[PDB]
């Protein structure tokens, strides 16, 4: 079941990292939201790569 | 409000055009599923459009 | 016809099976799967 969670971890976190990179107002637009967009995108995109490693490793099971 | 009636015309004409062009194999479930789902999609669209056509409450927030 | 808007049209037919061909007709009706029997002798124990 880790491959399903890992595929959603690729897709959802890649979309979230792209929405932090382009300064989308549903993620950056508030005062309580983080200030720097690509600084959060750089640490969400690496998590997308980590879940892609889990998806490739559990895809050969 | 006339952009709700203008969508009701093109939904109702589509449903009438599907009532006469339904497949003969399963008529009472082709023209019952598709015609009722267009009605319910139009009903939720009209309800979500008319609540914002003339609103009484303005959106108010502090953090922006 | 199809019967998804209302029910299908039932008839209440009446067969007469002789004793020579009785098991064969019963095993035929078991394979046809169209005849819903009704218990005629309800008053018997």
Curated annotation (Swiss-Prot), chain A:
Keywords noted in UniProt: Endoplasmic reticulum, Membrane, Transmembrane, Transmembrane helix, Vacuole
Biological processes, Gene Ontology terms: endosomal lumen acidification; Golgi lumen acidification; proton transmembrane transport; vacuolar acidification
Membrane topology annotation: Multi-pass membrane protein
Cytoplasmic side: 21-43
Record protein name field: V-type proton ATPase subunit f
Record GO cellular component, one term: Golgi membrane
Subunit structure: V-ATPase is a heteromultimeric enzyme composed of a peripheral catalytic V1 complex (components A to H) attached to an integral membrane V0 proton pore complex (components: a, c, c', c'', d, e, f and VOA1).
GO MF term set: proton-transporting ATPase activity, rotational mechanism; RNA endonuclease activity
Origin: domain of life: Eukaryota
Residues passing through the membrane, by range: 1-20, 44-61
Residues of the full protein shown: 12 to 72 of 85
UniProt subcellular location: Endoplasmic reticulum membrane; Vacuole membrane
UniProt function note: Accessory component of the V0 complex of vacuolar(H+)-ATPase (V-ATPase), a multisubunit enzyme composed of a peripheral complex (V1) that hydrolyzes ATP and a membrane integral complex (V0) that translocates protons. V-ATPase is responsible for acidifying and maintaining the pH of intracellular compartments.
Curated annotation (Swiss-Prot), chain B:
InterPro entries given in the database record: ATPase_V0-cplx_e1/e2_su
Gene Ontology CC annotation, any one: proton-transporting V-type ATPase complex
Chief location category: membrane
GO terms for MF: ATPase-coupled ion transmembrane transporter activity; proton-transporting ATPase activity, rotational mechanism
One Pfam family linked to the record: ATP_synt_H
Alphabetic keyword roster: Hydrogen ion transport, Ion transport, Membrane, Transmembrane, Transmembrane helix, Transport, Vacuole
Intracellular or extracellular location(s): Vacuole membrane
GO annotation terms (biological process): cell wall mannoprotein biosynthetic process; endosomal lumen acidification; Golgi lumen acidification; protein-containing complex assembly; proton transmembrane transport; transmembrane transport; vacuolar acidification
All ranges on the Cytoplasmic side of the membrane: 22-32
Lumenal topological domain: 54-64
The protein's role, per its UniProt record: Subunit of the V0 complex of vacuolar(H+)-ATPase (V-ATPase), a multisubunit enzyme composed of a peripheral complex (V1) that hydrolyzes ATP and a membrane integral complex (V0) that translocates protons. V-ATPase is responsible for acidifying and maintaining the pH of intracellular compartments.
PANTHER family to which the protein is assigned, alphabetical: V-TYPE PROTON ATPASE SUBUNIT, VACUOLAR ATP SYNTHASE SUBUNIT H
Subunit structure as annotated in this protein's UniProt entry: V-ATPase is a heteromultimeric enzyme composed of a peripheral catalytic V1 complex (components A to H) attached to an integral membrane V0 proton pore complex (components: a, c, c', c'', d, e, f and VOA1).
Protein name: V-type proton ATPase subunit e
Gene that encodes the chain: VMA9
From Swiss-Prot, chain C:
PTM description: Glycosylated.
Top-level lineage group: Eukaryota
Subcellular location field: Endosome membrane; Golgi apparatus membrane
Cystine bridges: none
Membership in a protein family: Belongs to the V-ATPase 116 kDa subunit family.
Quaternary context: V-ATPase is a heteromultimeric enzyme composed of a peripheral catalytic V1 complex (components A to H) attached to an integral membrane V0 proton pore complex (components: a, c, c', c'', d, e, f and VOA1).
Other observations noted: Present with 1084 molecules/cell in log phase SD medium.
Job of this protein: Subunit of the V0 complex of vacuolar(H+)-ATPase (V-ATPase), a multisubunit enzyme composed of a peripheral complex (V1) that hydrolyzes ATP and a membrane integral complex (V0) that translocates protons. V-ATPase is responsible for acidifying and maintaining the pH of intracellular compartments. Is present only in Golgi- and endosome-residing V-ATPase complexes; enzymes containing this subunit have a 4-fold lower ratio of proton transport to ATP hydrolysis than complexes containing the vacuolar isoform and do not dissociate V1 and V0 in response to glucose depletion.
Protein name: V-type proton ATPase subunit a, Golgi isoform
Shown segment, full-protein numbering: 4 to 48 of 890
């Amino acid at each position: 079941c880790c491959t399903v969670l890992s595929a959603f971890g690729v897709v959802i976190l890649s979309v979230i990292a792209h929405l932090f990179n382009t300064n989308h107002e549903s993620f950056v637009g508030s005062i309580n939201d983080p200030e720097d967009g690509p600084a959060v995108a750089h640490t969400v995109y690496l998590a997308a790569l980590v879940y892609l490693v889990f998806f490739v490793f559990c895809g050969f099971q | 409000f006339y952009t709700v009636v203008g969508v009701f015309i093109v939904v109702s004409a589509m449903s009438v055009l599907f009532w006469i062009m339904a497949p003969k194999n399963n008529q009472a479930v082709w023209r019952s599923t598709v015609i009722l789902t267009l009605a319910m999609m139009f009903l939720m669209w009209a309800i979500t459009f008319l609540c914002q056509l003339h609103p009484l409450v303005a959106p108010r927030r502090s953090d922006l | 016809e199809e019967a998804i808007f209302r029910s299908a049209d039932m008839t209440y037919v009446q067969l007469y099976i002789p004793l020579e061909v009785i098991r064969e007709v019963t095993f035929l009706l078991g394979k046809m799967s169209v005849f819903m029997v009704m218990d005629l002798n309800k008053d018997l124990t």
